[PDB]
Design a protein around this ligand. Structure first.
Ligand SMILES: Nc1ncnc2c1ncn2[C@@H]1O[C@H](CO)[C@@H](O)[C@H]1O
Ligand SMILES: Nc1ncnc2c1ncn2[C@@H]1O[C@H](CO)[C@@H](O)[C@H]1O
Ligand SMILES: Nc1ncnc2c1ncn2[C@@H]1O[C@H](CO)[C@@H](O)[C@H]1O
Ligand SMILES: Nc1ncnc2c1ncn2[C@@H]1O[C@H](CO)[C@@H](O)[C@H]1O
Ligand SMILES: Nc1ncnc2c1ncn2[C@@H]1O[C@H](CO)[C@@H](O)[C@H]1O
Ligand SMILES: Nc1ncnc2c1ncn2[C@@H]1O[C@H](CO)[C@@H](O)[C@H]1O
Ligand SMILES: Nc1ncnc2c1ncn2[C@@H]1O[C@H](CO)[C@@H](O)[C@H]1O
Ligand SMILES: Nc1ncnc2c1ncn2[C@@H]1O[C@H](CO)[C@@H](O)[C@H]1O
Ligand code: NA
Ligand code: NA
Ligand code: NA
Ligand code: NA
Lengths: 468, 470, 468, 468
């Protein structure tokens, strides 16, 4: 039978299956992908270790991969983002998953290592990564197993301390050569997110990347949809569920005006806030001003905004000094990927009063307070349900095609140990698969029209440098 | 000291959580908190015995505790079977105030609880009613009518709810002392009422001469049309739909039936969240407004096969029928933000297969296997699937309610309020708005005396004629 | 040989006729009114003196009145609002009109007086007024003729001085008792505008109103459409034609948040400005705040807005002190109806440099400059073309119906010397006449549904105090 | 004094100078570029032949180039886009310019040729091009001079035959080797638009590009600003001036959802239209749908839109059949670069009635009509004033830096006979120069923060593939 999982509560599986089924209707790209490739079973023989937010949307991805023949083990890539009913449904479907909403950082890393303990013996031969954590376990352990262990002795953060301790433990406990075995078996890794892509390009440029990688983040139908439209929908959802505050009449500050900040500022303005923005990039700042946002510094915003959202991917955006200047019961949250955008650690010796899960009131010596959401981690996934299914279908269709590329379309070793992106025609295919469900009717070029603009009728329609 | 038992809530252990969100809400309701400060010293509701029937939310908890802070004795129920927020109800019970309200109580339970308002703790009856939808008011008048001998109507129910209500009146007539409804009627000093249907029926009883006590219509305050209905629904309609379904709104088509103030706010809610919004209307002025706001104005027959989301906002009946729902696309979402559960023909769906997804979310399957997603069984979706309107906008409505309670209870020594329906003056509308400006950082300009004279108003207001529409 | 007119240049008549024809297609309420009432000729025998912005839209109103049997003389109610080609077309059709874009204030009032010199002898018997200027001429003259002359020597502005000069001249030049003769013959006035309606109530309150009046301003289908949607379209139109400035990136200040201020703030926001608002009314200030506008004082706004729009109906809103504090080349304009919202008179000792018609640059002693549009008068009509035809059709269908009421439907004296409003049944009918052109499909109440909400199937649908 | 120009009326110079002065305040990037490079005179010795819309904004660019030392001759790149007062001011400043609003196609091309007859003898040594017309004349003439003349006899449109007639006339009239002489002396071309850049890459890929090229279109601070925000402001402006129609209540159709179509659809939605879009590219279609636009075919839109806007860069988008099915008095216009998106030529057999400059009513035999703007040419520039100055300052600051690059910074032959874009640091500087004018306050990265995200504090802040 099947017992190989760790979830909050398996009795949530029925509720998970109901919402998965509903999500399927909202994820036409993944469902069409099942129909197209189901008969050819291109992932038969794949052993996919997946590390990505264990949500309802990711469940539809998991089952798509399975529908295509893949064998799978899964973990979440964040401690708070798991939806426990999604995890229980996957476990009940007989797929190993180690994901609990609110697991500790120590648990998180121990679960990541369970990805590589393949059921029935052996290791994975594919990785599907969001943030590069599974990829980093392999590379760090390989590095150390070869004899370069110095870096493990000097961790740079609390989380890095736990991660390095994991690598040491695995080196002690596993058979000699375990990391080299893993690295040689991985046929490829498709990476979802800017932080992991950064790690890939760094490894690729030092010659230490161990297997081919596909950068799904820079697919057009990911990077121009996922956070732009996803954050537009899910950022205010998080804030409403956390606080139930009236947004009309409030002033909000968004730090950063990349894809995440863009979608986040739109979410708050559409909901009725008067939105201010900070930026270090003069082009991004100009975009913000042209969209009608006042562009200011955090020192300017600190005493006056009602709501603060960090969206920079940098560190020390909202400091202790900012939060001391904040008005009483100002709301503070983060939708960047790490919890160091806000100086959370500097608040830990203040009085915290829990309101409900992922909502805390923090009181300062002068007795003014702030409302912190999700302890300064991803507010959309921590306080609500993350991005809705339809946009995640686009990202996850890219992931599915990327797995097929690496696992089934590398007979000629067109993918070496470097970072690739999907070709534009597959990118366009992802979009195509999502048009019928929302009633889009695409115009077909006549031959004379296609020649007139220098494209084939069937695409690709734009050069590879086109920015959309 | 002694153990308090005079309540019915889901779980008393939610009281600490309720108290926490009540405290947060106080900061967001400056109108109520200022009213506490102003009238606290004079205790204008000392001696008031207020029976309240209003959605037992966090926001209503602040209203309740405002009434109490002004001296009132209180018993409370919700006015909708799904609108209660169980932590708010628990906090009120823990404060020793009788409350009978559970999210997801049945209709039969609902009406039993309404009756409990009138059994005053320690003896006697209420002497004030704070009503939302007229249910407490109707119980008194229907019982009085039957107690006086006119009983035929009790055997003529037009809905399941009327069946249950008429059964309740019959039971109360059998169980309570003779003359009970007359006694209640004699002791009620006034009612304040917030809703369009509640107000409609007050005016109708007034014209018929059957209204039993003075009434104040707070529904025609500028607050209800221009703030509560408009901005509340703009904020809370999509909230309800998101929590119920987690669907992506960008890319979807939505249909809103009605374009009065609730449909205005509802359509705005959906458009701001990224839907393409269509609207239906029977009023050509309201329809022309919708068109001018950029909404396509179509019939429900037109909308039925093509919208992804349907929202009823008409206050009328039989808006979305069994025929319309048969024609909808698979897994269209249907919900109601008008006040009664008959805008959608929910009763005609009960012979079909219902699969419950989670509280207030059900998937309904037709014989051709096509499905719809029904929110809150056709009842107020913002309150059923989410947390209703946010605290800041309820502050103004609830300040109006408090002011109306003061007027009827404390300011009727001269009988300025007969057995008729009255409205608060514009000076109160301006004062209530003014109480909210500082919280959201509004800097009001002060007219100089010459500018005041030039436009023909006093520097302190009122600034508009009484027929001004804002 | 028709000579009884004054226009800038009669050669523009052909161009005027073409745009009048286009506007008819855009004004279905007026054209439906011609079809319904043409056979009966209810305005046969009416002698309408009209004082209302001589635009293409007003030309369609004029010709609607004429199609119903009216004899007409016409003037503009503002010195910059005339569209010279519309005026030419009216004159070319044999209708006396005295309206030149850019006429002087003295000419303006001379022209108002010509309304009452009926061609072929006599006086008018109806007034259609916008702003109350023609009504005021009759009442001030009557007042003085009856012996109460002192006010004629107490002017408080240049315009009052000119108006009182006109009254003195007419009393010297016309037959004794002329004003009483006019007053006796005017069957009614219909008044369009808040300023004129306030003049009407003053006089009705005092018992000095000389004839019945219908307040068209407070039709729903005027005051919930005319200013709200008209200014939303025409305010930025005026600013763009006058200055061609980029509105995205700029900050705008709107004084006033009545229906003109509501429409004006909307126009600017939709055009990409960040909009701020001043108000004295806490209900309107709270509306503005709930719509996401920052509500501030003009002292706060003066050094930081790029664009200033007064919309108050009050005086001394933007002062010389405000304008000295403004940034170099800030834009200032007015869409309230006088020209004392901004302190224009106080600017007349400064160096003015004309850029083009209705656009001037005013230089202060410190060399900073402001850009003044239409000399502080109505900016949508002065720098552009006013509200677009469609929304004016609703207002002007109201006017036509009000003229019919007073002229043809007062045989029983239901309208005494007081101010009346059109009934809601007519208001709903005005709305109905515009629905098909924009493709609205109205739902029809079934009888049980009409009974359920307490209305007749055919309306009216709302109580008389409903605010929409 | 100075005689070498062709403009509509030199008396318009004073008016031109006033609006240029006003634009200078609105174009800080250009004025700051004058401040920075003026003392260096980087364009001393430059002989720039410019082909670009002779607007007020282009005047500031021309005078900027002159201020940096350039000798200049100029023409418009469209027969309707000239602003006559701008042209007159330029002429009056002593700069040869040949640009009249409403010039004929034959005049247009004859003027283009006048660019290359340099005043005082010789040829230009730089080209500043918008749409590649000046570039094409040089390369077409070279190709024929080299002996490949067959193409000049196979024309396909009216403008094509005029262009080939021009080339033949110049070959016949000028000395032998004239185009080779021009090509030898052209140091570089900077090109502003998609159409022109497309021609450039094609020539560069065939080895036939005759001189270095900089593609200014794909600067981020051009492509993500110019038509995104420019069309958002200027498309409805053109429609309003041309027709004065109420946009609220109306349905509009935009063909295309590239940057021009994105900005155009926004222009119409913000003005109050319900907006439908067509697309052939499924990614762009998905973008339109996610922004809430209904995505339809032209066959679907033809009988129900009130307003049609072509923005595809393609041909045969709105056909005679489409137009026969449009409702009476539908508005039709084009904001793509040539007049073949709409089948204007097929309309030349019907009754055209001119309303006013650039506005025509076209009658079909069944008497239904359409309103055509600018005879199907660039509506924002033909019916109004094009993009406002502020956004053009960014475009034109890029142009100035491109001319400096090619003329003054090619001592090491870093620019060969291929197409280049400006470096990201210069792109960032362009945005930087515009921030203060709109009150943007940019955050400065701390050293530790810049390290953390992998950039220098002074930028570049994004990789070269970042899409913004
Ligand atoms: N300290 C910071 N403050 C504001 N924005 C930042 C900061 N660091 C990076 N960003 C911006 O955040 C976006 C996403 O990384 C980028 O556009 C980047 O310029
Ligand atoms: N429902 C979801 N399932 C999986 N990943 C998600 C979901 N919502 C957001 N994300 C991802 O989590 C981060 C926070 O939005 C982004 O990387 C985003 O792509
Ligand atoms: N059957 C109906 N369909 C659509 N709108 C309606 C219907 N009945 C009432 N309304 C509208 O609902 C709004 C709110 O009651 C009013 O503007 C009213 O005209
Ligand atoms: N949070 C809330 N608490 C109490 N009543 C509410 C709340 N939100 C909305 N309502 C009321 O419920 C109805 C639906 O919005 C309206 O009558 C409104 O006033
Ligand atoms: N001095 C003023 N400043 C700002 N708003 C004003 C002033 N006077 C009147 N108003 C407002 O202008 C609007 C239109 O008259 C009204 O809502 C009124 O309150
Ligand atoms: N095109 C127009 N024709 C006639 N009157 C107009 C026009 N545009 C605006 N108005 C009136 O002029 C004032 C300024 O918009 C308002 O009173 C408005 O009703
Ligand atoms: N025939 C066409 N119909 C609709 N859109 C088109 C057509 N041809 C090109 N486009 C789109 O126009 C945009 C601008 O070139 C591109 O996104 C392209 O896909
Ligand atoms: N005011 C202007 N001056 C010069 N070029 C312009 C102007 N406005 C728009 N353009 C250009 O003309 C085309 C149509 O908007 C685009 O290529 C745009 O860059
Ligand atoms: Na979700
Ligand atoms: Na709430
Ligand atoms: Na007009
Ligand atoms: Na311009």
């Amino acid at each position: 039978g099947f017992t190989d999982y760790i979830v909050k509560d398996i009795a949530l599986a029925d509720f998970g299956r109901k919402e998965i089924s509903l999500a399927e209707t909202e994820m036409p790209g993944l469902m069409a992908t099942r129909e197209e490739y189901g008969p050819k079973q291109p992932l038969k023989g794949a052993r996919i270790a997946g590390s990505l937010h264990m949500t309802i949307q990711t469940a539809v991805l998991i089952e798509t991969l399975a529908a295509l023949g893949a064998d799978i083990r899964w973990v979440s890539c964040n401690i708070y983002s798991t939806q426990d009913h999604a995890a229980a449904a996957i476990a009940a479907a007989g797929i190993p998953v180690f994901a609990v909403k609110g697991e500790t950082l120590t648990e998180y890393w121990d679960y990541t290592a369970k990805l590589f303990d393949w059921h029935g013996g052996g290791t994975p031969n594919m990785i599907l990564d969001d943030g590069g954590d599974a990829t980093m376990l392999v590379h760090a352990g390989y590095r150390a197993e070869q004899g370069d262990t110095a870096f493990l002795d000097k961790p740079g953060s609390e989380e890095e301390e736990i991660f390095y301790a994991l690598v040491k433990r695995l080196l002690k406990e596993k058979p000699k050569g375990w990391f080299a075995e893993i690295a040689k078996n991985i046929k490829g890794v498709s990476e979802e997110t800017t932080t992991g892509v950064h790690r890939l390009y760094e490894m690729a440029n030092k010659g230490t990347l161990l297997f081919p990688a596909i950068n799904v983040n820079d697919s057009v139908t990911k990077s121009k949809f996922d956070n732009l439209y996803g954050c537009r929908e899910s950022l205010v959802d998080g804030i409403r569920r956390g606080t139930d505050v009236m947004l009309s009449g409030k002033v909000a500050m968004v730090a950063g005006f990349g894809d995440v900040g863009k979608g986040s500022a739109a979410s708050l303005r559409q909901a009725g806030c008067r939105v201010m923005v900070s930026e270090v990039d003069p082009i991004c700042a100009l975009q913000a001003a042209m969209e009608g946002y006042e562009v200011v510094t955090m020192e300017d915003a600190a005493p006056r905004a009602d709501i603060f959202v960090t969206a920079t991917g940098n560190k020390d955006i909202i400091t202790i000094e900012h939060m001391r200047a904040m008005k009483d019961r100002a709301i503070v949250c983060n939708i960047g990927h790490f919890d160091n955008e806000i100086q959370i650690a500097s608040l830990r010796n203040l009085k915290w009063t829990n309101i409900k899960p992922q909502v805390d009131e923090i009181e300062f010596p002068d007795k003014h307070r702030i409302i912190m959401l999700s302890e300064g981690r991803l507010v959309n996934l921590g306080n609500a349900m993350g991005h809705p299914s339809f946009v995640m279908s686009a990202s996850f269709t890219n992931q599915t095609l990327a797995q097929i590329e690496l696992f089934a379309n590398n007979k000629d070793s067109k993918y070496a140990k470097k970072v690739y992106v999907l070709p534009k025609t597959l990118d366009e295919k992802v979009a195509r698969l999502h048009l019928a469900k929302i009633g889009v009717k695409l115009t077909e070029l006549r031959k004379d029209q296609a020649d007139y603009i220098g494209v084939k009728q069937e695409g690709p329609y734009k050069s590879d440098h086109y920015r959309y």
